[PDB]
Design an enzyme around this catalytic site. Structure first.
Site, PDB file in Angstrom:
ATOM      1  N   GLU A   1      -0.456   6.124  15.800  1.00  0.00           N
ATOM      2  CA  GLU A   1      -0.525   4.778  15.200  1.00  0.00           C
ATOM      3  C   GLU A   1      -0.864   3.780  16.301  1.00  0.00           C
ATOM      4  OE1 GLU A   1      -0.866   3.138  11.707  1.00  0.00           O
ATOM      5  OE2 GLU A   1      -0.482   1.879  13.471  1.00  0.00           O
TER       6      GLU A   1
ATOM      7  N   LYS B   1      -0.888   8.199  -5.346  1.00  0.00           N
ATOM      8  CA  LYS B   1      -1.646   8.364  -4.120  1.00  0.00           C
ATOM      9  C   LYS B   1      -0.965   9.302  -3.137  1.00  0.00           C
ATOM     10  CE  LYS B   1      -2.695   5.280  -0.292  1.00  0.00           C
ATOM     11  NZ  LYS B   1      -2.736   3.829   0.050  1.00  0.00           N
TER      12      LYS B   1
ATOM     13  N   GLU C   1      -5.453   8.152   6.000  1.00  0.00           N
ATOM     14  CA  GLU C   1      -5.558   7.223   4.865  1.00  0.00           C
ATOM     15  C   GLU C   1      -6.497   6.022   5.286  1.00  0.00           C
ATOM     16  OE1 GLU C   1      -1.542   6.141   3.755  1.00  0.00           O
ATOM     17  OE2 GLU C   1      -2.273   4.372   2.663  1.00  0.00           O
TER      18      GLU C   1
ATOM     19  N   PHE D   1       0.792  -1.225   0.000  1.00  0.00           N
ATOM     20  CA  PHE D   1       0.000   0.000   0.000  1.00  0.00           C
ATOM     21  C   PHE D   1       0.836   1.293   0.000  1.00  0.00           C
ATOM     22  CE2 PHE D   1      -4.626  -0.822   0.388  1.00  0.00           C
ATOM     23  CZ  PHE D   1      -4.585  -2.182   0.256  1.00  0.00           C
TER      24      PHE D   1
ATOM     25  N   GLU E   1     -13.325   0.738   5.874  1.00  0.00           N
ATOM     26  CA  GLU E   1     -12.199   0.592   6.807  1.00  0.00           C
ATOM     27  C   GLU E   1     -12.541   1.223   8.181  1.00  0.00           C
ATOM     28  OE1 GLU E   1      -7.901   1.163   4.933  1.00  0.00           O
ATOM     29  OE2 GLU E   1      -9.097  -0.456   4.034  1.00  0.00           O
TER      30      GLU E   1
END
Ligand SMILES: Nc1ncnc2c1ccn2[C@@H]1O[C@H]([C@H](O)c2ccc(Cl)c(F)c2)[C@@H](O)[C@H]1O
Ligand SMILES: Nc1ncnc2c1ccn2[C@@H]1O[C@H]([C@H](O)c2ccc(Cl)c(F)c2)[C@@H](O)[C@H]1O
EC number: 2.1.1.320
Lengths: 307, 318, 303, 318
Positions: D73, D14, D116, D8, D125
Site C-alpha cells: 500500500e 464485489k 482492485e 468503496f 485508475e
C-alpha cells in the site's frame, strides 16, 4: 579499385549475380551531407562489400533505388532524381559508363524490371506512373497512370515481352498485357502489396508479399483459392526464386531476416545474419545452393541453403 | 532549438575558461612521465552540438595528453549534429551516447565529467539533479567540472520592470501568475538596493548520503536609502576547476561573457523601504519526484505572501 | 513579382541544390528533412538500434537560410493511419521525430500530405506536435483539386472509371481538408498547398477552395502545354485559376522533373505582369484585406 | 480519504466475487494431497484498509489452504489501519509493505497477485501501469487477479447532462476545459443511442515484450433513431478468475454492485444524428513517462475537434 570512388555508401540496395558468377552492387547514402549513390562490380563474390577490392566502380549523382542486369554488359538504374539510367561496362570490364540518363518520371523511380526479350524495360515510380522504355532508342514508348497511390513493385513476365505484374499502395495488383486497349487488369484475392515474383517454371503462377509479412501464392487462371503463409513479422520487401529446375522461394524483409520456402510455403531456412533491413537475395549461377543477401548494415552474407 | 545552441555557443570566454579548466585537470591527473601510459576517460554530459567536446580536444592538445571522449546528449536533434561531427572530423575518439545522463549505463567509469547544465540562477536548469544521477559512473576519485556553483540574490527597485511583469498576464490562468515565476532579463533601468549575497550552493561530486537538493535560505539585506522594492535579481558564480571560474555577479563578473543574463524574481506587491531598514527575504528550493521549483517571501520590513507555493504558478520539469 | 518555390524529393548536396535552385530564380525550396527512402524503426531490434547519423546536419546551412528558404516535407513512407498497427505506431514516432526536427531547425513551413479520406491519426499527431513546445512553424497540407483515384487513366479493364457526374464526389478533396482542419480545432498554423491537376475539375469544385487558407499552390511540370516556340505555357482556364490565386497572394510551388528547355517561372511572372489593373478600391484596400476593424461610433465617441 | 475507502468497502457483492476468485485459484494451484505441503504466496497490491486481504483469509478458510499474505500500500494513512489490523487480529500471516508496488523489492516471488486498481473505465485508475511494474515479482507461472479488463463505450444523448457539464466552467483555466475530461456520474436522465461496444482491453500478466499500454480504437455505432449526441458513456467489464467476473455494462451488469458508477466523456459541441446514420468515434489512450490520459474525436456523421490533445485539459498522474 580502378578509376572509381574510394568509399561505397553504407546502405546496400541491390545484389544481382550475372551468368558467369560476377556480383553487381547498387548502393546509396540515405544519411549524411551527401545523399548520392554508386554502382560496383565484384568478379569475386567474397570480395564484397570491400570498396578497394572491386573489378570496376562508379558514382551516380543521385541515390540508387532499384537495379536490373541488361544482359551481361549493361545495368538499368532507377534513381531518386526521377530518372532511369543504363550503365554499360567498357571493353575489359574495368569501367562502368553511363549510356543514358532520362528524367521522365516526376518523382523517385522506385522500381525497374527488364522485359523478357532484353530490348525493353518497365519502370514504376512514386509519381504513380508506370513507363515502358526502349533501351536502344533512349525513349519512353508508353506512360500509364493506372494506379491511385505511388507504385511499389513492377515485375516483367519471364517470357512474354508484353506481360508484367504491378503493385501499389492503392491495394492494387495489376496484371498487364500491352496486347489490349485496356492493358491493366486488377488481380484480386487486405494488406498493401509490397513485392512481386513471377514463377520461373509456371509462367501462369506468381507470388506477392504484403506489408504484414505475409507471402501469397496466386494463379493467373483463377482469382480465388490462394495459398498463403505469414513468413515475416514486417513488410515483405523482396521475393527471389532459386535457379533450380524446382525452385526455392527466398523472401527478404524489414524484420531483418531471410527466409527460404518450398512449394507448400513452409520454412526450410531462416537467417538472422542481418542487423539492419534485408534488401536483396541473389542465387549463384554456379552453386545453386548459394544465396547472397545484401542489407543496409553493409553486410553481404553468403548462405549455404540447406537443400 | 538549433539557433538557441548557436547563441549559447558564440561566447569565446566561456569555452576558453572550460578549455583551461580541463587543461589544469589533465596535468594534475597525468604526470609528464605518464604522458602516454594513461588515457583519461572524459565524459561531457549534456553535449549540445559539441562545444565542450571541442574545447576538450583543444585542452588535450595544449596539455598534450590522451583522452577517451564521450558525448552524452538527450535532445536527439543535437545528437544528429554530434554524429555528423563524429563521422566527418572527431573519429572513434568521441563516443556519442544518445541518452539522458540519468538512464545511461556506462561501459566504464570516468576520470572527469564535464557539464554546462547551469543557468542564470546556477541550479535553475537542474544541474544538481542531473550530475547526481550520473555520479555512479564517476571514478571513486574522479573530477566533476564544474565542481561548485552558487546562486546570489540582491534586492532591486524598478517600477519599470515591475510594469513589464504586470503586462505578462494571460487569459485562462492565475491573474497574478506572472509574479510567481522568474524571468531571465538583461536588467537595465533599475536600482540595486543592496549588495548581492549568496543563496544556494551545490558541490560536485557530492559524497554525502541523504544528499537532498532541497533548500531554505534566509537573507538580510541592509538598505541605506529610501525606496520601493519590486523584486530580487539573481546571479550565479561557479568554480569549474581550482582558480578557473565563471561568474555573472556584477562585482565578480567574468569580463565579456555575454551568454548568461541575470534572473528576476518578482513580488506581487511592491514594498516601501525606509533608509536604515533591512529587507529580509526567504527562498526555498523545492521538489517532488516529477518537478523542482522555488518559493519565496519577504518577511521584513513587512510580509508578503509566499510566492509560487507548491510550484502552482511555475515549475522546472525533471 | 511572384513568390515561387522549387519542390524536389532528391537533394544529394544541400548547398549545391539550394544554390542551383536560387540560381534558377526560386525564393525557396521544399525538400525532405530526412532521406525519403530512409525507413526507420522505433520498436523492435535490430533496425531500432540503427547507428550513425539519421540525416544531414544543421551546420550545412546558416540559421537565417533555414528560417527563410527551406520548407520541410514529411517522408512519404510515414503513414499514421495505416490499417497495420505496427506501421501506425512506427509512423506516429516517425512523424513526431520529423516534425520536431523541422521545429529544431526553425523552418518557416512543413509539408504534409492529404491523399486519403481517413486522416484522423495524422491530425492527432499534428495537433500534439502543436501543443508540445514553442515553435510557430506553419503547416501546409498538400491536397489536390482532384483525387488521384479520380484522374487515373481509364485502362484497368475490370475496374473502369465511373464517368457519371457525381456532384458531391467531384468535391471529395475538400471534405478531406475540412475534416482534418475540424479535427485540429481550426488551428491558424494549418493552411492549404493546393495541387492543380492536368485536367481542371468542375467550376463548382474550385469554388469550395474560396474562403479557405490557401498559402501555396502546387503546379506540376506535367500540366504545362507547349507553345509554337517549344516553351511551357498554360491553358486559358488554368490561367484564370492563376489570376484568382494571385489576388489571394499565394506562393506558387513548382514540382516534378523537367520536360522543357526557369521557363515555368517566367510564365507565371509573365501572367503576373500582364494581369488586369487593380482599380482605386483595390489600391486603397491593399493592406486592409481581411483586417477586422471596429465600426466607428461617432455619436458616442469623438472622431 | 478514510470515508472514501469506507464507501468503496460497503459493496458485499464485489468482495464476495473476489473471495470466490481466490477460492477457485487455491484449489487449482494446491491439490487435496498437497493441502499442507504447499503455502501460496498471496500479494494484495493496493491493499487499502485491508478488504481484499480480509476476503483472501475468507477464501483460504473455505478452500482450506495455507497462504503467506502481503499487503503492499502506498497511501501511508491506510497503512496505519493495515498495521493496526495486523497487530490486533491478522498476525504474522500478513506482511504489510508500506510502498508503491513499482518500487518494492520483494523477498520472494508470488503465486497470486490480487488488485482492485480499476475504475469505471477499467484502465482509468492506471491498473495496467501498476501491475506491469509489479510483474517481475510474480512467479514464472503465477496468477494475476483480475486477469483481464475491458472498457466499453456507448453514445448518448442528454441535453440535461450536456448542461451539467457546461456549468463546470471555472475562472483561470480553458473556458471549454470542462468538456475535455471524463466525469464519473450515475447517468439517470439520458438516452442511449447505440449498444455499448468494447474499447480497450488489458490482460495480466502480460508476457509480450514492447508491451506498450498506449491505444487507438475506432468504433462505429449504428443509430436507429433521430437525435443530438452529447457524449459517450463508459463502462467496464473484468475477469477476476475463469467464470468469476465483475461488470458495470448495463447488459451484463453484476447484480447489486453499487461501487463503480459509469463514466461520461463529453463533446464540446452537440451533434445532430439522423435515423440510419452511424456515429463513428475514435479514442486514444496516451502517455508519457509522467502522465496517462485520453484523447477522442467523433469522425461520423460529422467531425469534432480532437478532445484533450496532449492531456492539456486532463491527465491521470503516474
Ligand atoms: N539529464 C540530461 N541528460 C542528457 N542531456 C541533458 C540532460 C539535461 C540537459 N541535457 C542537455 O544539456 C545541454 C545543455 O543544457 C546545453 C549545452 C550547450 C548549450 Cl549552448 C546549451 F544551450 C545548453 C542541452 O543540450 C540539454 O539537452
Ligand atoms: N502503484 C501503487 N502502489 C501501491 N498502492 C497503490 C498504487 C496505486 C494505487 N495504490 C493503492 O491501491 C488502492 C486501490 O486503488 C483501492 C483499494 C480499495 C478501495 Cl475501497 C479503493 F477506493 C481503492 C488505493 O488504496 C491506492 O492507494
Amino acid at each position: 579499385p580502378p578509376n572509381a570512388p574510394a568509399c561505397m555508401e553504407r546502405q546496400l540496395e541491390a545484389a544481382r549475380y550475372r551468368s558467369d558468377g560476377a556480383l553487381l552492387l547498387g548502393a546509396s547514402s540515405l544519411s549524411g551531407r551527401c545523399w548520392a549513390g554508386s554502382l560496383w562490380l565484384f568478379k569475386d563474390p567474397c570480395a564484397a562489400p570491400n570498396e578497394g577490392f572491386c573489378s570496376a566502380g562508379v558514382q551516380t549523382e543521385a541515390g540508387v533505388a532499384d537495379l536490373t542486369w541488361v544482359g551481361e554488359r549493361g545495368i538499368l538504374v532507377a534513381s531518386d532524381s526521377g530518372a532511369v539510367e543504363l550503365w554499360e561496362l567498357d571493353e575489359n570490364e574495368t569501367l562502368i559508363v553511363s549510356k543514358f540518363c532520362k528524367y521522365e518520371h516526376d518523382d523517385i523511380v522506385s522500381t525497374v524490371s527488364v522485359l523478357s526479350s532484353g530490348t525493353q524495360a518497365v519502370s514504376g515510380s512514386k509519381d504513380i506512373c508506370i513507363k515502358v522504355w526502349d533501351l536502344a532508342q533512349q525513349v519512353v514508348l508508353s506512360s500509364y497512370r493506372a494506379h491511385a497511390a505511388q507504385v511499389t513493385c513492377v515485375a516483367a513476365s519471364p517470357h512474354k515481352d508484353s506481360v508484367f505484374l504491378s503493385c501499389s499502395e492503392d491495394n492494387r495488383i495489376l496484371l498487364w498485357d500491352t496486347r489490349c486497349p485496356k492493358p491493366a487488369s486488377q488481380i484480386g484475392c487486405g494488406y498493401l502489396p509490397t513485392s512481386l515474383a513471377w514463377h520461373p517454371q509456371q509462367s501462369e503462377v506468381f507470388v506477392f508479399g504484403d506489408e504484414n509479412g505475409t507471402v501469397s501464392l496466386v494463379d493467373t487462371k483463377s482469382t480465388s483459392c490462394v495459398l498463403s503463409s505469414a513468413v515475416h513479422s514486417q513488410c515483405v520487401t523482396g521475393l527471389v526464386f532459386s535457379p533450380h529446375s524446382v525452385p526455392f522461394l527466398a523472401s527478404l524483409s524489414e524484420d531483418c531476416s531471410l527466409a527460404v520456402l518450398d512449394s507448400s510455403l513452409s520454412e526450410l531456412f531462416r537467417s538472422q545474419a542481418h542487423r539492419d533491413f534485408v534488401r536483396d537475395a541473389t542465387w549463384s549461377p554456379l552453386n545453386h545452393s548459394l544465396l547472397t543477401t545484401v542489407g543496409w548494415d553493409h553486410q553481404v552474407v553468403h548462405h549455404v541453403v540447406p537443400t | 532549438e538549433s539557433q538557441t545552441y548557436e547563441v549559447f555557443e558564440k561566447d569565446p570566454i566561456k569555452y576558453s575558461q572550460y578549455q583551461q579548466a580541463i587543461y589544469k585537470c589533465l596535468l594534475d591527473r597525468v604526470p609528464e612521465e605518464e604522458k602516454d601510459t594513461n588515457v583519461q576517460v572524459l565524459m561531457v554530459l549534456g553535449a549540445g552540438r559539441g562545444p565542450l567536446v571541442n574545447a576538450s580536444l583543444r585542452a588535450a592538445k595544449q596539455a598534450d595528453r590522451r583522452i577517451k571522449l564521450y558525448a552524452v546528449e538527450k535532445n536527439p536533434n543535437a545528437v544528429v549534429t554530434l554524429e555528423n561531427w563524429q563521422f566527418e572530423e572527431w573519429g572513434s575518439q568521441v563516443t556519442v551516447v544518445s541518452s539522458d545522463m540519468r538512464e545511461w549505463v556506462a561501459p566504464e567509469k570516468a576520470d572527469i565529467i564535464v557539464s554546462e547544465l547551469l543557468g542564470s540562477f546556477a541550479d535553475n536548469e537542474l544541474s544538481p539533479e542531473c550530475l547526481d544521477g550520473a555520479q555512479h559512473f564517476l571514478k571513486d576519485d574522479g573530477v566533476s567540472i564544474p565542481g561548485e556553483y552558487t546562486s546570489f540574490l540582491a534586492p532591486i527597485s524598478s517600477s519599470k520592470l515591475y510594469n513589464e511583469v504586470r503586462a505578462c498576464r494571460e487569459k485562462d490562468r492565475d491573474p497574478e501568475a506572472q509574479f510567481e515565476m522568474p524571468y531571465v532579463v538583461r536588467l537595465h533601468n533599475f536600482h540595486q538596493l543592496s549588495a548581492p549575497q549568496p543563496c544556494f550552493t551545490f558541490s560536485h561530486p557530492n559524497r554525502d548520503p541523504m544528499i537532498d537538493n532541497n533548500r531554505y535560505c534566509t537573507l538580510e539585506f541592509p538598505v541605506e536609502v529610501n525606496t520601493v522594492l519590486h523584486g530580487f535579481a539573481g546571479y550565479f558564480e561557479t568554480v569549474l576547476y581550482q582558480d578557473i571560474t565563471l561568474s555573472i555577479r556584477p562585482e565578480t563578473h567574468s569580463p565579456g561573457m555575454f551568454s548568461w543574463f541575470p534572473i528576476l524574481f518578482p513580488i506581487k506587491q511592491p514594498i516601501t523601504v525606509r533608509e536604515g531598514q533591512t529587507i529580509c527575504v526567504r527562498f526555498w528550493r523545492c521538489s517532488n519526484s516529477k518537478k523542482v521549483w522555488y518559493e519565496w517571501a519577504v518577511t521584513a520590513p513587512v510580509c508578503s505572501a509566499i510566492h509560487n507555493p507548491t510550484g502552482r504558478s511555475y515549475t522546472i520539469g525533471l | 513579382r511572384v513568390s515561387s518555390g522549387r519542390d524536389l524529393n532528391c537533394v544529394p548536396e544541400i548547398a549545391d541544390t539550394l544554390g542551383a535552385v536560387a540560381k534558377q530564380g526560386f525564393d525557396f525550396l521544399c525538400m525532405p528533412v530526412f532521406h525519403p527512402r530512409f525507413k526507420r524503426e522505433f520498436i523492435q531490434e535490430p533496425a531500432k538500434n540503427r547507428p550513425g547519423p539519421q540525416t544531414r546536419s544543421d551546420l550545412l546551412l546558416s540559421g537565417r537560410d533555414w528560417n527563410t528558404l527551406i520548407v520541410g516535407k514529411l517522408s512519404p513512407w510515414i503513414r499514421p493511419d495505416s490499417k497495420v498497427e505496427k506501421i501506425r505506431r512506427n509512423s506516429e514516432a516517425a512523424m513526431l521525430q520529423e516534425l520536431n526536427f523541422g521545429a529544431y531547425l526553425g523552418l518557416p513551413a512543413f509539408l504534409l500530405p492529404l491523399n486519403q479520406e481517413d486522416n484522423t491519426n495524422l491530425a492527432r499527431v499534428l495537433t500534439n506536435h502543436i501543443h508540445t513546445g514553442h515553435h510557430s512553424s506553419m503547416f501546409w497540407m498538400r491536397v489536390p483539386l482532384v483525387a488521384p483515384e479520380d484522374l487515373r487513366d481509364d485502362i484497368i479493364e475490370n475496374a473502369p472509371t465511373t464517368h457519371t457526374e457525381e456532384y458531391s464526389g467531384e468535391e471529395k478533396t475538400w471534405m478531406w481538408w475540412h475534416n482534418f482542419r475540424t479535427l485540429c480545432d481550426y488551428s491558424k498554423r494549418i493552411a492549404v498547398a493546393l495541387e492543380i491537376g492536368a485536367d481542371l475539375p468542375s467550376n463548382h469544385v474550385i469554388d469550395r477552395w474560396l474562403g479557405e487558407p490557401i498559402k501555396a499552390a502546387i503546379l506540376p511540370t506535367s500540366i504545362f502545354l507547349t507553345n509554337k516556340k517549344g516553351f511551357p505555357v498554360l491553358s486559358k482556364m488554368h490561367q484564370r485559376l492563376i489570376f484568382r490565386l494571385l489576388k489571394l497572394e499565394v506562393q506558387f510551388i513548382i514540382t516534378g522533373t523537367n520536360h522543357h528547355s526557369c521557363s515555368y517561372l517566367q510564365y507565371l511572372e509573365y501572367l503576373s505582369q500582364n494581369r488586369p489593373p487593380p482599380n482605386a478600391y483595390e489600391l486603397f484596400a491593399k493592406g486592409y484585406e481581411d483586417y477586422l476593424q471596429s465600426p466607428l461610433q461617432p455619436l458616442m465617441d469623438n472622431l
